[PDB]
């Protein structure tokens, strides 16, 4: 707050540097969201066009943002433990309660990734050796910032269609990372964004 | 009284969202001026 800062310039320019500063007026930090479900969805591709990811954006509750910010929601325990706690606090599906990946900008955070692909996704020995490539890109992703570097509030990423090429071994989780990176840009900047 | 002494403050860059008013200097004296010389702590609140 505002004493706090004058006591430690008060600090830095007595206690240890005597130098005169140029000291601007203070602002505050921002953060962003989303409001709405996606538009029609973007799938990107890396420079050599080998693996794409499908994801949409659309919210999660004010409650699973800020029961995540109080670790109840916490994805440490079991899948399925973590699962009934999902359906008996928010009617959450089934399907979609036993598929969550991350959480975003640390070990806690305001977003949620889902995955919902129930044809597509029985390739699971080709999804899971580049989820954690996706998670790589995620959590970097949304502690970064879009627009003006800020955080990510309040907004559930969702992916719908897993396109990834048979035995890539070195391209694919070092491609994989920005392209995750990118479509993550494309599905918040796409529909509705908010500060 | 009488005065003692006598691309960072980029007027496209600053939020004046409530204009400066003039008693912030003294009541917090750091951070509202530059080269805040002989300068005298208030005691604030009893």
Redesign the interface.
């Known amino acids: 707050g ?2 706090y ?2 006591c430690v ?2 600090d830095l ?1 007595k206690m240890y540097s005597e130098i ?8 505050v930090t921002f953060c962003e969201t989303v409001v709405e479900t996606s538009s029609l969805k973007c799938f990107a591709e890396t420079p050599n066009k080998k693996n794409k990811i499908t994801m949409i954006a659309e919210p999660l509750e004010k409650g699973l943002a800020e029961d995540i910010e109080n670790e109840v929601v916490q994805i440490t325990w079991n899948r399925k433990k973590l699962g009934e706690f999902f359906q008996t606090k928010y009617d959450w599906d089934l399907l979609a309660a036993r598929s969550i990946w991350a959480f975003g900008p640390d070990a806690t955070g305001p977003n949620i990734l889902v995955d919902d692909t129930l044809p597509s996704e029985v390739d699971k020995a080709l999804l899971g050796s580049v989820k954690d490539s996706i998670v790589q890109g995620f959590q970097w992703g949304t502690r970064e910032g879009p627009l003006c570097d800020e955080l990510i509030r309040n907004v559930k990423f969702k992916i719908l269609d897993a396109v990834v090429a048979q035995e890539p071994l070195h391209r694919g989780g070092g491609q994989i990372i920005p392209t995750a990176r990118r479509v993550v840009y494309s599905a918040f900047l796409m529909a509705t964004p908010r500060l | 009284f009488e005065p003692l002494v006598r691309e ?2 980029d007027i496209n860059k ?2 004046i969202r409530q204009p ?1 008013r003039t008693e912030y200097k003294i009541a ?4 509202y001026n ?3 010389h002989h300068v005298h702590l208030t005691w604030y609140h009893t």
């Not at chain 1, 005169?20 to 602002?27: E, L, Q, S």
């Not at chain 2, 917090?28 to 951070?31: A, G, K, M």
């Open positions: 505002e004493l800062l004058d310039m008060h320019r005169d500063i140029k000291v601007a007026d203070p602002v | 960072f403050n600053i939020i400066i917090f004296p750091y951070l530059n080269l805040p």
